[model samples]
Target: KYTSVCVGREEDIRKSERMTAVVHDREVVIFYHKGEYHAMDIRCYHSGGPLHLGEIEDFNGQSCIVCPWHKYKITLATGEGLYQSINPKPKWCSKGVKQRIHTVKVDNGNIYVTLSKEPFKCDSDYYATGEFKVIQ
Candidate 1:
């Protein structure tokens, strides 16, 4: 089962553009883009790049997170890597990679993230009434 964990206030995240939080003992990067909020794993698939420090870029009408170290690009919506390889790869090797995305939601001016892959019951009043635990 998954529980709604409050990372921060909605306004703060919107003002800061991006924020990092520890959700379920794992590093998570949450960012606001095109008037929406997105959450994903902070480590890059290629070389453990700091994805929070990467750049948000537009490619082919899609928003991608480009790795700061190797310039690997992954689409925000689908977590699909854009390029085949950062460098030349062996013919037998697979070129594509992807990142893991998390489910995020905004409720009553608070941001909630569910670490599980499956959907959980949203506790709307948990954060609104200050009855939730903080993710550290």
Candidate 2:
């Protein structure tokens, strides 16, 4: 069973555009957009990059977050690695590897991240498609 961990409160998170949390001794990034909360690993999968320090803006009309290293773009709604679409994987690992995006659930004005044993599948249906206008 997956339990809810208090990442942060709605008000506190709202005040600051981004927040960082420690999960399993790993750094995690949590942010809010359009009344919804999204969470993802702060480090870039391709290289040890700090996403929190990256630029927060929109791309191709979709609200996207760009990684500081190599400028990897990831959808806050769906943690799909944008670089994969442009760069083909090596023949050895055709399956490909993507940054793990955590499932988000808000309860009682508190945001909780679900990091359970079962992993969430990423696909067109689950992917977030659309432009995200910067609130600021």
Candidate 3:
């Protein structure tokens, strides 16, 4: 089952590029870029670093957040890890690590997050049929 929780007002996040909030008892990092909002798990995939305090950077033209602890970079779009070069990337990451991304929507100046127990998977058929447009 999925639950929709109201985290905060959109104006609160617009005041800053990034902000941290607890929704469904889980810490979440919310960011605004290019007139769009994104929310993801707050813990780093590597070492539970505070991703909300991480730096926002661009990797291959995609907006990413570099974990402050080990410099692990994760994309804001798909919650996919891009790179981590301290000693070497961890096996968990190399085996296809992912951060959970919450569905975000702004309605009437309120920010609502749809939370799920598991990460959401995109249906290939939806894209194949052009039902959903992929934004780059």
Candidate 4:
């Protein structure tokens, strides 16, 4: 089970393209891309880098968040990590789901965020406390 928090207005996110909200003390970043809304942990799973400042791009038909610090590509919908295989193999290698993703709902012009059912399952959740968040 999960609870939804009203983060902002739908109009606000539509205009800003991206917005950040704190849900259950965890920072989450929501994106508006190509007419869809996607949410995920605000920090990179690799090194707690500010994923809000990262770029959004599509990899293998899946929309991904490009971390600025290390250029790690994390899917916006599934929070799965994808990397390029330089060797003679498939182009993209699945690194497993490392980043945490949340469900987004827009109702009556309100943007609500519902966190993942399983908390702390992703490595990025570890960066939600202590010295890591102070970088705010």
Write candidate 2's Cα lDDT for 1-136 as tens digits.
3556778787888887788886554457887877777777766654556677777666555566787767867777666555333453422112232556677787898778775343454332112223322211
Flag clash pairs in model 3: none
Tens-digit lDDT track for model 4 on 1-136?
3698999998888887999999888789999999889988888878889999998999989999998888989998788899878863558878777988899989898999998865458878777656754232
Specify the highest-lDDT model's number.
4
Report the C-alpha displacement of residue 120, candidate 2, in angstroms: 7.8
Per-residue accuracy of model 1 over 3-110 as CA lDDT, tens digit each: 878999999988878999988776778989989888877777665667799999987677988989889787777666775434534222223335777888999999
Identify the superior model by lDDT, candidate 1 or candidate 2. 1
Looking at candidate 1, what is the lDDT of residue 93? 22
The TM-score measured for candidate 3 stands at 0.74
lDDT of 3 by residue, 12-90 (tens): 8888877877776667788888888888877765656777888888876778888887887787877777753366343
The CA lDDT of each predicted structure is 0.72, 0.62, 0.70, 0.85
